[PDB]
Amino acid sequence: ASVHGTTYELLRRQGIDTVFGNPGMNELPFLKDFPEDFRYILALQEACVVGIADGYAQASRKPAFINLHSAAGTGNAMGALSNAWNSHSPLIVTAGQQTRAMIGVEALLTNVDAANLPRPLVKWSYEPASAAEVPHAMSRAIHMASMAPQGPVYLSVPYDDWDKDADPQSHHLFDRHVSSSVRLNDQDLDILVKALNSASNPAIVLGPDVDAANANADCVMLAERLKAPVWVAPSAPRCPFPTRHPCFRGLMPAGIAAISQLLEGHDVVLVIGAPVFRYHQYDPGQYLKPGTRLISVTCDPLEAARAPMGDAIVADIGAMASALANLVEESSRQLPTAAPEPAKVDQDAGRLHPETVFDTLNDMAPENAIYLNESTSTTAQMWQRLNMRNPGSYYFCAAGGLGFALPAAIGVQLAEPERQVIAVIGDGSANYSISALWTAAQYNIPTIFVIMNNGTYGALRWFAGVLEAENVPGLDVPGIDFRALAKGYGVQALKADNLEQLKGSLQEALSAKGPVLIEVSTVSP
Amino acid sequence: ASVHGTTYELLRRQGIDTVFGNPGMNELPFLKDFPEDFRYILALQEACVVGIADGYAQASRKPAFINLHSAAGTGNAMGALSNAWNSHSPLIVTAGQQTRAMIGVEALLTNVDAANLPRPLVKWSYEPASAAEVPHAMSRAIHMASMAPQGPVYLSVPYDDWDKDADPQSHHLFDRHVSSSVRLNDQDLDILVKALNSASNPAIVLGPDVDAANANADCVMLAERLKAPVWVAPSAPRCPFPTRHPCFRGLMPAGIAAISQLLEGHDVVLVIGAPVFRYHQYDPGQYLKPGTRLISVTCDPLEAARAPMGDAIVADIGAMASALANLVEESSRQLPTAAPEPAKVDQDAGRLHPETVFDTLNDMAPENAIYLNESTSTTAQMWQRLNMRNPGSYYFCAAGGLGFALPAAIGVQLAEPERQVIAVIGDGSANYSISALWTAAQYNIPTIFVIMNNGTYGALRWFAGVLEAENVPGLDVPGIDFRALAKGYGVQALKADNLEQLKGSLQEALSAKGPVLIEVSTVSP
Amino acid sequence: ASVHGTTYELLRRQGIDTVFGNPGMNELPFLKDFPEDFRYILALQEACVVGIADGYAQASRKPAFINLHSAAGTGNAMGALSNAWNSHSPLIVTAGQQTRAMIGVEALLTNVDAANLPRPLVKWSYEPASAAEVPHAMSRAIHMASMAPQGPVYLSVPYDDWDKDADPQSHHLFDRHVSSSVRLNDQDLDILVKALNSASNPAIVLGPDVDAANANADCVMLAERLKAPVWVAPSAPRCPFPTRHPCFRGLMPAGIAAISQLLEGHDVVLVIGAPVFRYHQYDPGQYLKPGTRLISVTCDPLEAARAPMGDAIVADIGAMASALANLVEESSRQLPTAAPEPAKVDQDAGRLHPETVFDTLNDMAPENAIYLNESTSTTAQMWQRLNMRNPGSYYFCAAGGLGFALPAAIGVQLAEPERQVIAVIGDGSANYSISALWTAAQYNIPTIFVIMNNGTYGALRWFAGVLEAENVPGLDVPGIDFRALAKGYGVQALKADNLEQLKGSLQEALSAKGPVLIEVSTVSPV
Ligand SMILES: Cc1ncc(C[n+]2csc(CCOP(=O)(O)OP(=O)(O)O)c2C)c(N)n1
Ligand SMILES: Cc1ncc(C[n+]2csc(CCOP(=O)(O)OP(=O)(O)O)c2C)c(N)n1
Ligand SMILES: Cc1ncc(C[n+]2csc(CCOP(=O)(O)OP(=O)(O)O)c2C)c(N)n1
Numbered sequence A, B: 001a002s003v004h005g006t007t008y009e010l011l012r013r014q015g016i017d018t019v020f021g022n023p024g025m026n027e028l029p030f031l032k033d034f035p036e037d038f039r040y041i042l043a044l045q046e047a048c049v050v051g052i053a054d055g056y057a058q059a060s061r062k063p064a065f066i067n068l069h070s071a072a073g074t075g076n077a078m079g080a081l082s083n084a085w086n087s088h089s090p091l092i093v094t095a096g097q098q099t100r101a102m103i104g105v106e107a108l109l110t111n112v113d114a115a116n117l118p119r120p121l122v123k124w125s126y127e128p129a130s131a132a133e134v135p136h137a138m139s140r141a142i143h144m145a146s147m148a149p150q151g152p153v154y155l156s157v158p159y160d161d162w163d164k165d166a167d168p169q170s171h172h173l174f175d176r177h178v179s180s181s182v183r184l185n186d187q188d189l190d191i192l193v194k195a196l197n198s199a200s201n202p203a204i205v206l207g208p209d210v211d212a213a214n215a216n217a218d219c220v221m222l223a224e225r226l227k228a229p230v231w232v233a234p235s236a237p238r239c240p241f242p243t244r245h246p247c248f249r250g251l252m253p254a255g256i257a258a259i260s261q262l263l264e265g266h267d268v269v270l271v272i273g274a275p276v277f278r279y280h281q282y283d284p285g286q287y288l289k290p291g292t293r294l295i296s297v298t299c300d301p302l303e304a305a306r307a308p309m310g311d312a313i314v315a316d317i318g319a320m321a322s323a324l325a326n327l328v329e330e331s332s333r334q335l336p337t338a339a340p341e342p343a344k345v346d347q348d349a350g351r352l353h354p355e356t357v358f359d360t361l362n363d364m365a366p367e368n369a370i371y372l373n374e375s376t377s378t379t380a381q382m383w384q385r386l387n388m389r390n391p392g393s394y395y396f397c398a399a400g401g402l403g404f405a406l407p408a409a410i411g412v413q414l415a416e417p418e419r420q421v422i423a424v425i426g427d428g429s430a431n432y433s434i435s436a437l438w439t440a441a442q443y444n445i446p447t448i449f450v451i452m453n454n455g456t457y458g459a460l461r462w463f464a465g466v467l468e469a470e471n472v473p474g475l476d477v478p479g480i481d482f483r484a485l486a487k488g489y490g491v492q493a494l495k496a497d498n499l500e501q502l503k504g505s506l507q508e509a510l511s512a513k514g515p516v517l518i519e520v521s522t523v524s525p
Numbered sequence C: 001a002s003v004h005g006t007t008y009e010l011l012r013r014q015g016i017d018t019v020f021g022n023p024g025m026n027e028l029p030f031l032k033d034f035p036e037d038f039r040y041i042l043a044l045q046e047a048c049v050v051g052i053a054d055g056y057a058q059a060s061r062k063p064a065f066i067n068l069h070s071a072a073g074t075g076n077a078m079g080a081l082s083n084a085w086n087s088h089s090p091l092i093v094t095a096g097q098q099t100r101a102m103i104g105v106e107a108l109l110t111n112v113d114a115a116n117l118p119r120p121l122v123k124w125s126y127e128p129a130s131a132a133e134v135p136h137a138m139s140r141a142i143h144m145a146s147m148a149p150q151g152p153v154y155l156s157v158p159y160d161d162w163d164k165d166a167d168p169q170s171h172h173l174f175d176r177h178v179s180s181s182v183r184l185n186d187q188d189l190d191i192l193v194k195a196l197n198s199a200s201n202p203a204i205v206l207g208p209d210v211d212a213a214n215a216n217a218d219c220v221m222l223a224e225r226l227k228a229p230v231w232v233a234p235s236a237p238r239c240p241f242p243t244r245h246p247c248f249r250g251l252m253p254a255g256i257a258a259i260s261q262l263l264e265g266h267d268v269v270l271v272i273g274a275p276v277f278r279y280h281q282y283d284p285g286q287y288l289k290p291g292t293r294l295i296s297v298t299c300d301p302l303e304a305a306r307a308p309m310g311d312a313i314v315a316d317i318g319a320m321a322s323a324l325a326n327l328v329e330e331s332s333r334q335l336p337t338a339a340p341e342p343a344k345v346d347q348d349a350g351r352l353h354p355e356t357v358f359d360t361l362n363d364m365a366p367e368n369a370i371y372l373n374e375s376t377s378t379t380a381q382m383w384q385r386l387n388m389r390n391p392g393s394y395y396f397c398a399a400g401g402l403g404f405a406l407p408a409a410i411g412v413q414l415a416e417p418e419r420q421v422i423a424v425i426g427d428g429s430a431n432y433s434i435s436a437l438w439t440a441a442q443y444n445i446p447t448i449f450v451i452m453n454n455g456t457y458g459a460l461r462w463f464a465g466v467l468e469a470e471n472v473p474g475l476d477v478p479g480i481d482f483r484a485l486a487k488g489y490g491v492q493a494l495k496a497d498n499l500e501q502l503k504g505s506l507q508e509a510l511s512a513k514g515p516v517l518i519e520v521s522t523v524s525p526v
């Protein structure tokens, strides 16, 4: 068989049936004779291609396949690649390389030193030394992406390899099954269990790897057993817990001092599926107040090694959560009391306060909605005013890289056609990957886009104030008609200048059958 | 406290008490006020420094700490790092960098783009952005090297960082315990054990991670239970099974065809702590023959990803091995029959054959001896003729990089002062790190060095013969006097031109007080 | 044609006839049927292989070809490559890779991510995408090494490539001639010449690239016309100027403050072929005192960019030096004030002071001797006491990496059979590349090795002192017998325990036919 055929067989047999891409001259020899059991998803830009794939991989909890054009295409995606890395997304990035005979002369379309391009934002980057090796390298890439901790990979392949004769011994790759579903040995696990049952005032902290592992329900059972308060690790890329559950305590502020102070009083603090920690703002202080010990359970050796305090276990989050939830005894302590309901902010007949939007989104959206956030100045209000009962109901750019929510909201919706995806994106952030809108329309992927328009970078201006920094240029974004952009890419558009219009626009988008964008006028800071 | 104080406190609390090094100007501010509870092992050149630390780390099954000088020192040790990578040696390599104020002008001794230098032969590579961050980076290096899969790490530290004040929060890293002692979940583990129980003709292949995890005994119990034959994986850097056990079948040849042929007949083949496969010579064919199904247990995701066949499980070798040995049913099949005893080769009163040397060593060395091998052309005869009952009995350069055995043998002897270490080393390979001899004499480490002197790069002449390659230069190394080399570095020397002399020198060396080198006149190929 | 035949044809057509190597299996398909117009130099260890090739490349002023084994052999030589990078040595480093079919499975001997290995110490790292591209790749490596600024390059070749058919169009690369022999345009050169003519108190500073270009004599002319004092840039890897010329000022100490002080009062300071500057010891102060202007002529963009002060011109040192020597006016100023003569140090009949050794070498050695230095605590004294009036008379680890001088002194001597190489090497430094001696014996290369045995890492102890560092481990190296090491590798050995023995040993070694090692008992700094 050919490399072309042997490779499509490898993907098939590994459970791959979708290729998100933007094509070039180097990817043609691979894209040709596109099998009937595969489906192609075009995006007009590479950051969009990878963002859609990303959203898709995270929601489906399975690797996504990507096909990009040489260096220019690989480069245009590296922003999105930055987010994927931080979110442990299993992305198999494949880029086309110039014909082997033209690489030396560095002809146009030649990915020079290709393996180094994506570094250091990838787990594995490689260019095969021969055509016949392609299938095997594809196997490595697939498994390298899928193994815990999950992450994006990169494979460069000359477009002249696809027609070449594949190595018959390649068939051994087809049904290779690699497992990293592992957990702490019985002995050291019983000691951890013992320590948990002996804790007088334990707290729990959950990160994105919990939602990734669909370990959410096990973490609920674990929290209820231990009758422990639950927090989401700072800068959360996902939601690992029910926001209305009695134990839930909200999202931790992304600061050293704020976190140690919040943990003060708790003797044992168990962190699951989160870096320790994902700080953001400057808040020098004590990592942990005396009397508080920390135990981290991550699937990433890099997270475990860099943690400034506490002990760590490197195991699979799905396996560990399940074991712990089924091992720990039921504490007699009283079950924590659910946090009070956020008060309703005063709203006039003019511009809408972000608080009003969320309260409104929470009232009208189906219970199994899926929210994406890239309204940077309103993350706190969002996490508080949005009741998210189910797994994989929240997504936020994991390396803080803007341009992720728009496309990712498309990939998620594609992966979850039964759940209404609602992307909440600031007017600034909506520009980074605006072209992505075209994909939602072309394939009729029914994402509802909510654009919060403050005419500026609320977040940036804020930080500006927390630095007393005056005379900063480039913070305003006036003169952007999001309705016209939506029209440009064939997506139904709507506007809400007030609460009355907001309620109306939302009505009509949940009833609509295709993608819908709503530009909402929000107060300025 | 100073970064200096805090850093040594960290090393100490993490169980490190030994520094293997060759000092430079950028290392003195680190080395000054050397605490009494630490020991410093000086080697004359950096391949020797690392090699010794490698042997030490492998034998002790704990991280070894190394201190080298900037780029030139790190550079000199690169070859040694390639072996360490392949052998998963937990080595924390640190190099002195120019004072921060003089980095910009690239002053003499400035490690340019330092983190990139050792790549790609290290798990992690880093230079802290500030002095206060040194301790934390050191904590990372420590854990990144100890965690599975174990391997060398690299830390570059500007020499002015040591006197600066350390962060008071750094005390949290002192007692951080990180665990990767994990095994497959209960559900999937059951499936595996059932598969092993159901096998009609099982075979077991073992690699170096078995010996490193001291799982040798557990593997012995496993093979006794399944009554299946046991093989060591090709290009073995270690021995993880009694070479006299009834199940032991020896070192697999390092060829694709030869391995698939050996494995023909066995329905299920269990590979533990080894790559699949570490082939060497070009021997094209089938990876496996039909009827054979492969299951691999590895602690390194890189190995699981690049296996061209079989299923893989990524987990700690210790926990996995111990789990399987105490779970599998005891087959009723008849325990395999021990392999015959190598045949005695005809030996005249002249040049000694490698077979004779090994037979004499075996009939004279203590039962708990430890052997290192850098006698390239006689590896096969070595594995057949040495009885190695105990774990940690064999070391061989894991990436084939010559210059390992000699320093490593000193590192091992240092690690195991109660076990007589005997390094067998070709006349060719003895020169790569000849200078390490001095460390053996200086620190009174009684390692025995057997130099197999045939006057030529033997394994090279062999290969050249298989490739029908003619007129190849640089294969002969005449005119080296090893006794004179040993006298040069203060190491007692003896020579064995015949058997009588061999017996006598061996008896004298085993008795001698300090290190001893025997130059043996062997026959050529 | 095979890739093997074509590659060897390219090498000869490019002037290469020597291959410095340590063979491995991956390199055997390359070394086989070794052509009769080529010669192979074996060294027993990689750093020794590269070090010899380095000395050979620097002395001959031509690129040198290297053949090493996969990752491990490349790795062993990376310390030596750090020195070569700093000395702009044109070294073509080739390493054999596993057969293309066994790279994926990462068989033993596989060089993983090979091109990344020697980075950041190479101008170019590459592994070709196919067998037929090898020749083109070797062409690139050859030219990347030879083009200013010259440096080491790296090429990894799967061993199954050598037998495969080469592209017939590969013959176009045979006579390819690349030139970077360039100087500053006429208009901007005139402006520079005017600034030199108009200077009231100009000073000249010269680095290693001057000696590399053989621009020493043009610098002499220039220094004479400008009647300017001449200094060698700090951490000098080579000697760019007659040490006894009336203009010679000596070696600049490697300190910021020391240098601005030495340059005070000079209105214009012209630096040629050196980084600005290769400082060493922490010596904070003013880069340049006010009233002092700096002009740097370098062949390396990296050097011009990183200079903390001054204007820079990136051009060929050979051409720029020649143009300037022949363009400047002759000044009627008086020559620099004569340098004091270095004093004869107090010397008993016991252990030898470095200064006694240097004066004695200077008295007995031929006018055209070549000295290498890896005697780390005696460098300043060496420069004062050795009269080197010829080009290419001095070499010293350019990145400060020990293990250079001994192998390099062999490369140099091979390259200069008519000039007597004298390597002055510390007891510490001698160990990094001890096995190189074997190469001297085998090919009968008459290098003389002077081992300065003081029992200690002298420079370190000194630094420990200038730091007030107490209880530093590992500064002593007792119990090394260098006569034994020499015998071990088949090199004739002598011992100098005092002045009388030293004189006799030097006389004897200067008349010997093969290589000689002299162990000199010197006084310790203690
Ligand atoms: C690609 C990228 N560019 C720039 C930034 C820095 N940044 C963070 S928030 C922000 C403005 C976002 O404003 P908007 O999306 O309108 O939401 P708001 O902050 O107004 O709530 C910028 C530029 C980033 N995180 N990613
Ligand atoms: C650092 C390094 N250099 C070169 C090689 C290639 N090589 C492998 S075996 C060998 C000859 C070894 O000679 P000797 O130690 O005498 O063993 P023998 O083959 O003679 O038994 C060489 C040059 C290597 N593997 N590693
Ligand atoms: C590869 C390498 N290792 C270590 C050093 C640090 N170093 C610089 S000088 C020196 C002392 C060398 O001693 P020796 O050769 O006896 O000369 P001496 O100082 O006694 O004159 C050392 C270890 C270095 N520069 N390069």
Ligand SMILES: [Ca+2]
Residues within 6 Å of the ligand: B426, B427, B428, B452, B453, B454, B455, B456, B457, B458
């Ligand atoms: Ca030999």
Ligand SMILES: [Ca+2]
Residues within 6 Å of the ligand: C426, C427, C428, C452, C453, C454, C455, C456, C457, C458
């Ligand atoms: Ca010394």
